[model samples]
Target: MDDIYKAAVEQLTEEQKNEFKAAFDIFVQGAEDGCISTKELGKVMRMLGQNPTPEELQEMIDEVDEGTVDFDEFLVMMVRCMKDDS
Candidate 1:
């Protein structure tokens, strides 16, 4: 599977890797609908590590706060964050 594992490994900080791995492994052990898959969640976090522009992250935070972001949209935004460093 072309999963986020590769990207997460490259993107996560030394401190973050362990936690991300633990969380992702747990999620994989017990998968569920309505749950953000570990791969997707990891992608999102990795994207965040890239340090998005303030305006972009703000829009994301706002969308999340407003409950307007679906899982796919959230993931997409996260990926977008990786494109630019603030």
Candidate 2:
């Protein structure tokens, strides 16, 4: 729902939020459990046009540490990655 989507992504511009939400749906469509895994997060990151290296991806995954992140939590990570590098 846009209610939580808006709340989760308020810091992002209207368009970026739209992009990520669409990305979520896109990935979730093929996701077996409707749960986006860190590996899938890497794919979605690439889907969103971020050219992250494996090391960079590893860092993001490390926080969740070999597990998965829900959409709400993934939104936080995704936005942070937008500003992750200096």
Candidate 3:
């Protein structure tokens, strides 16, 4: 696992971790090639209980190359959001 993912998940309980993994799996399904596109990103964000503004989503989209995000990018965003929430 990526270090960012490790740190992000370290704060979660086993149940929370399972839920997180399940959600991740579902989000990956949004892409045919196992990546999340700009359109799918919003749905994944909402699935994770986030209501990001259009600008916020755009900012995230910018961080992602080719308008798509892989699991590593997703983990980085998730950890960044977790820190922001704290």
The lowest-lDDT stretch of 10 consecutive residues in candidate 2 is 1-10
Rank ordering of all candidates by lDDT, starting from the highest: 2, 3, 1
lDDT of each: 0.46, 0.70, 0.65
* TM-scores, each model vs. reference: 0.31, 0.66, 0.62
lDDT of 3 by residue, 1-86 (tens): 66655665566577855665667678665446667777776676667776666787788767644377776566556555656553
Clash pairs (backbone) in predicted model 2: none
Cα displacement (Å) at residue 58, model 1? 3.4
For candidate 3, the C-alpha RMSD (Å) to the true structure equals: 3.5
TM-score quality measure for candidate 2: 0.66
TM-score of 1: 0.31
Q: What is the Å distance of residue 2 in model 2 from its true position?
A: 17
Residue 55, candidate 1: Cα error in Å is 3.2
Q: Which residue pairs collide, candidate 3?
A: none
Alpha-carbon deviation at 31 in model 2, angstroms? 9.9
lDDT of 2 by residue, 36-86 (tens): 776788888778876667787677667643267667667766776777666
